[PDB]
Nucleic acid binder design. Sequence first.
RNA 1: UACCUGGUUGAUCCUGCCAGUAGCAUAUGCUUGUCUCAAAGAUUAAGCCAUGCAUGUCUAAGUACGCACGGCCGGUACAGUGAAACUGCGAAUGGCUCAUUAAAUCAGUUAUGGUUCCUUUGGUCGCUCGCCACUUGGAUAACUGUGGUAAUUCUAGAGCUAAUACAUGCCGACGGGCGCUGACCCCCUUCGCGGGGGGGAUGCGUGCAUUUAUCAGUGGUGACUCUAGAUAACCUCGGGCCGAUCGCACGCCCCCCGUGGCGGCGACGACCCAUUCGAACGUCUGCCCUAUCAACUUUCGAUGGUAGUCGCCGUGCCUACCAUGGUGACCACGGGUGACGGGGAAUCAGGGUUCGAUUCCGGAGAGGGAGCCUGAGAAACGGCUACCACAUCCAAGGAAGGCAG
RNA 2: UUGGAAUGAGUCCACUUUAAAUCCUUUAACGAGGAUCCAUUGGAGGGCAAGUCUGGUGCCAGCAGCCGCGGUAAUUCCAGC
RNA 3: AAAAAAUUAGAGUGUUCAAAGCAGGCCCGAGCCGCCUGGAUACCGCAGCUAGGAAUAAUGGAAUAGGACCGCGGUUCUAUU
RNA 4: ACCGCCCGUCGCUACUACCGAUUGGAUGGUUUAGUGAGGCCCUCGGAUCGGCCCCGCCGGGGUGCCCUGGCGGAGCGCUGA
Lengths: 185, 177, 262, 206
Amino acid sequence: PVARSWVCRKTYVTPRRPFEKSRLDQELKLIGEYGLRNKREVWRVKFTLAKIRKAARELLTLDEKDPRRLFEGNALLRRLVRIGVLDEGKMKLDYILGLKIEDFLERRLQTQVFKLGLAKSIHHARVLIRQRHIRVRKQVVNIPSFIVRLDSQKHIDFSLRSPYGGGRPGRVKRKNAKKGQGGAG
Amino acid sequence: FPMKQGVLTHGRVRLLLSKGHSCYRPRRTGERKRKSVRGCIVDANLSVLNLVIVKKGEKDIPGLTDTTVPRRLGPKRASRIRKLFNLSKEDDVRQYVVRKPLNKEGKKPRTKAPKIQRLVTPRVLQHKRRRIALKKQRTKKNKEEAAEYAKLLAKRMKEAKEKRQEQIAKRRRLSSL
Amino acid sequence: ARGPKKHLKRVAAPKHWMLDKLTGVFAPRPSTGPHKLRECLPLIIFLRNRLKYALTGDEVKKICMQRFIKIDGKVRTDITYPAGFMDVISIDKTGENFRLIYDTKGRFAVHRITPEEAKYKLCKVRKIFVGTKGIPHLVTHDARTIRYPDPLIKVNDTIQIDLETGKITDFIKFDTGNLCMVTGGANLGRIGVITNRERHPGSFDVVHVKDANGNSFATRLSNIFVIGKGNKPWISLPRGKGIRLTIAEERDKRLAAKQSSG
Amino acid sequence: GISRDNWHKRRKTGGKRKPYHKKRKYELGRPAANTKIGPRRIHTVRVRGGNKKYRALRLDVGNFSWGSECCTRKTRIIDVVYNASNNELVRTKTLVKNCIVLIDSTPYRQWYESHYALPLGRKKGAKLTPEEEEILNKKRSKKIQKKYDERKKNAKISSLLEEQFQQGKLLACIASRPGQCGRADGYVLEGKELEFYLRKIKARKG
RNA sequence: UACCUGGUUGAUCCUGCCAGUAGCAUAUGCUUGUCUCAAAGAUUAAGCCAUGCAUGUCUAAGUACGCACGGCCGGUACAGUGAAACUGCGAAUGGCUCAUUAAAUCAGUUAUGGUUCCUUUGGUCGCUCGCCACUUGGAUAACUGUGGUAAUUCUAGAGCUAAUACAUGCCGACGGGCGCUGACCCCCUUCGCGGGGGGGAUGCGUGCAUUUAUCAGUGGUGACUCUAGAUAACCUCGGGCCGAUCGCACGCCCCCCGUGGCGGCGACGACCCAUUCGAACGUCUGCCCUAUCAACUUUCGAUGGUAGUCGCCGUGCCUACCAUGGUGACCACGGGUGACGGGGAAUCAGGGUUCGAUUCCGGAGAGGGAGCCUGAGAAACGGCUACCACAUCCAAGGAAGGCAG
RNA sequence: UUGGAAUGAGUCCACUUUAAAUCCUUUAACGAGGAUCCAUUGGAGGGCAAGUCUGGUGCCAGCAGCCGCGGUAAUUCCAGC
RNA sequence: AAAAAAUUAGAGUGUUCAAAGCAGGCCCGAGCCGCCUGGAUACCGCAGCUAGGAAUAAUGGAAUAGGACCGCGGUUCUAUU
RNA sequence: ACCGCCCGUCGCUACUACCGAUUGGAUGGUUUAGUGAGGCCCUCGGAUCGGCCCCGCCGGGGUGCCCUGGCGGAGCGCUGA
Ligand SMILES: [K+]
Ligand SMILES: [K+]
Ligand SMILES: [Mg+2]
Ligand SMILES: [Mg+2]
Ligand SMILES: [Mg+2]
Ligand SMILES: [Mg+2]
Ligand SMILES: [Mg+2]
Ligand SMILES: [Mg+2]
Ligand SMILES: [Mg+2]
Ligand SMILES: [Mg+2]
Ligand SMILES: [Mg+2]
Ligand SMILES: [Mg+2]
Ligand SMILES: [Mg+2]
Ligand SMILES: [Mg+2]
Ligand SMILES: [Mg+2]
Ligand SMILES: [Mg+2]
Ligand SMILES: [Mg+2]
Ligand SMILES: [Mg+2]
Ligand SMILES: [Mg+2]
Ligand SMILES: [Mg+2]
Ligand SMILES: [Mg+2]
Ligand SMILES: [Mg+2]
Ligand SMILES: [Mg+2]
Ligand SMILES: [Mg+2]
Ligand SMILES: [Mg+2]
Ligand SMILES: [Mg+2]
Ligand SMILES: [Mg+2]
Ligand SMILES: [Mg+2]
Ligand SMILES: [Mg+2]
């Protein structure tokens, strides 16, 4: 009766225990360094890491002669290498289990803009990205959680229409210049 | 409520009317409906009564018999035109069709004639010819296929019989020992 | 219900048609024709979804109403005509002459054949009986009753028929060693050579097929369609010659194609 | 209306079954023909699929077969004499399948003297008519007469069939379904089957 | 991520539950700037409904004499267009809802060698021996006019005219064959010759389908009482088939040039077969709670046998006669269910618990029952008839109804 | 204490979208300092993250899923911070 | 062997990211008939069907021999030759 | 912490369940018996609508030796719906 798809899922899993001091402190520390609006953001990456590490676990359970172990085992490693969390010399499933939370969210776009030197603070990173100042290859990306891949790390730079760059000035200074033109005469 | 022939009552009965019955036209195929109809016996409790003059007397009622209105349509079927003008079989029908003048204001006075149906025409002769022609191919088709299959059946049995006779000849000889 | 159904839901449609989900609620209900609803490809699917000749359903009928698409040499103008396996689709306006042959994974591929090959097709023998006044009759996988067949032809054999005369030219017996293509089940779309045919009385007889590369599989006798004599096929093989491959070999071929190109 | 459904019956265990749907059109039954003996009256029944069934309300004639001679001719049905189902079915002269009836013996006797040239159904008096004499005893030429002389070798029929022909009444069994096909066809009783039904009819009389 | 914490005591270790904790999905409270996707009168009332709408449909190709338009024309049967209306088909799908329903529905699985099937697609359609055919018969709408009624998608009388409506009915093929019957004729034997062997006048019959019986064994199956063949017939008047149909290109022959013959491409139609879409009934195995349900079914079919009837067929489906069975603690029978069944959803160590009205499939119902018409297909409800409940209009005579679209 | 940079929510040409529209995407204009363009909902004894701060009430009013708090200096009520 | 799709797991694919979708990608020069693809895969309990295994568990074969096996003598019947 | 703890009747208040004359009452389901709408089937029935037939007459040949175009009859019979 409708040509619609209802397929959807949650990208995060809430904590089993609501008020555990050590978990609260570690989540705050992470939000603080990688500049994240909320604790949901620490749980999204944690959920993705948990699914990936869980996926690696049954593969390690299967013997090396398993065809199923090889195919998605190789595919899983390739995806991790592509996004830049795993070194290309690290082709062992045993090495996925050593991944930590900060590894996955180190590849976030907002961290790269600050690191590459585009922004002078991790909180300045999100402002630049959300204000449409960063292109990846040729496309402006306004999502701070945009996962940069190795293929595109080298190409992050200012957008063409960004006043910070080869861009006509932003509206606030445009209003001062006309004040300057009016003030002069 | 209209009167219905054959009811045989001075009053109003309800009947399950179907197609072909009077006083009822179905809205879809196979539909029946119960409707109230009045019997065929004439009484005082009638609003209007229909009368059909079968015999005309010597007098003349104004309006009824003063003037005669014509039939609005001429015959269409070829036999109907022939019957009207008592034509024989070996006659032409096209010229003996009724042609109705058209005399509306503004448009010039044109004439219209009906399309005669059921008439031998060059097309009907051909269509009948094509029907006979298709009968030929089918008869020819049968003959050829039954002829061709006769050869193949004859050849296949020859191969089968020769092999059937060949091996029994082989078995008989080795059975001599 | 109170009678035959006239609609087909898009998700209930056969998955081999490769139809998507968000285009609409219904899929083209295969108008009745020689093949089965689940083992056919509607013309609108072939003309619109595969060849991209038309972008919408209304443009599909614009082609069909112009009397361009020919199936088995006959101009078919019904957009939901069930084309089916081993059928020739002729578009003389462009000289395409496609044939519908299952690919490896079990779908209908866009297999182009030469006009010389487009003059015939291969048909499995479904039923053999003598009708009317002793005249033999041969029924075919596409329900083409053919009168007066060669008496050597039996059930499960494959016959070659000319599209013009609609008459058998030559046939292939069903014996071990012939080349067959699976037309149903898990091994749908694979091409191989019969090696054995075990038979259960009052049960589906099982046949064993050996691939060109040595991949041995089995299926029911109903899904077996002989497509050649001994090793040689009688028809052009599809883009993949009925070789199943495995998800790993697909990745290797896919990766090799990408890196070789650049 | 009448239904031939299975869901109105008790289960094999004896438990009652609650219907999950009302009566369906395909489950319908129709009233019995109760075919009688009389002038041919047949009503056509439109059945499932648009086909036609011939309800024979009353039939007087029927195509019966003489199996031992392969002579099948249309003969009038005299009456019903026996019925295995109900003795009330014969009392009302009802024509159903596998009911024993009496049929006219003339068309079969006519074939018998036209084929074998022997008397059949004549007592000791043997009242003669020129028509039977012409077909029975006449000069037929040497080649054909011999062919008729060899028939006499195997022209003999059973005494039980002989008496039936003496009385002009032939016992026959209905083999068709008059209420379905509209035809009361059958075959003549001969041999062990015939003599079985005489015992039943004779036991009925007492 | 195979996990707990608080609470009985003066304190202790326990049992053990309460409480906490997390997901899920209904409701609600408060609050809410951007964007994408998106459930949504299931629960209670399968409760009731104002109004509007939800199913119609014409091609070159069934039927136009509506000037309603309109080319052509004093000259033509019908240019074309085209309403109305007849005919044809569809309206049995879709949509909705989950009330009923517990070996039922349904699921896997198997069967029809036990059936019915519009349509499509292929086959089949001179296979029959038998004074209009160069084409037959009545009608009847639409229309014209004359009406009735308080009132309806109400209808009546009168007049007119079509067919692929509704009927009726050849010709041809067509020379015959074959079956039987057989006047008769010849021949060979000629103990006398019976006999033995050939032609043959007349007469009857004859295809397919139907119904019965008999015979002998082309192709098929694991297995037919299959398929095909032959013989004797039959064949329903409420009537099997054997084209009185239509468009388009317009040719060809013509010796005995006739408005003589002959022909191409379509459509429409057709008994029957195969096929497709199915449907229907069966096989095996599987369902929740309950004994404060332990015996049940069998008058009035229960379980078998036989013969029928009916049906689309198999069958206690029904009837007659007969037997006395059949089911049960391996839970029958009975009751309950806030029970439609399944694919699936939530939760997740493993095992498992709970949910599944709901978009896909199957089923069921259309306020409640019941009975039907038409049709290939309905026990149909945006069909009908009756009753019951509810309800509308009325001039009180009547008329009309069905949102779980 | 400032300072001038940036931007999209917003308003709003066209353009695109689409059966026609819409939203989204783009664009021109405009549009941020209390950037008042002002984030809520629950809690702060323990379980359980967070005060034995201050005022009010005085086993009352209330709170409190549980244990418990309140009887005139309440870490728990009603409030401010 | 056969077991609907959707859903679930899972391969590929910058929906800009993402839930999603089944798309997309290369090559500008001629599209001369553009080419180059993908639209996988696994699980479907129980029952049924198929072919191996033969431990484990159940069951059976000779005890009034009514016994296995080998040939021998008869009394019969019936098709094909 | 024996000046502890604690049991039952009785009296007060509230709430829940039970027994209970009333042949109590209401609704749903199933069913015996009686009545039985309507459909369908059968046996009838025959309002009405046709045809043919027989004529009397101008009507033409059956090669009056009755092609018969028309009107009235009455066919006063048969036959169909
Ligand atoms: K406080
Ligand atoms: K009645
Ligand atoms: Mg006509
Ligand atoms: Mg269709
Ligand atoms: Mg079988
Ligand atoms: Mg546990
Ligand atoms: Mg305590
Ligand atoms: Mg204490
Ligand atoms: Mg709890
Ligand atoms: Mg907006
Ligand atoms: Mg439906
Ligand atoms: Mg029985
Ligand atoms: Mg009985
Ligand atoms: Mg329920
Ligand atoms: Mg449920
Ligand atoms: Mg459900
Ligand atoms: Mg409910
Ligand atoms: Mg449904
Ligand atoms: Mg229904
Ligand atoms: Mg209602
Ligand atoms: Mg109904
Ligand atoms: Mg409705
Ligand atoms: Mg409906
Ligand atoms: Mg509504
Ligand atoms: Mg707390
Ligand atoms: Mg704390
Ligand atoms: Mg105080
Ligand atoms: Mg997925
Ligand atoms: Mg004391």
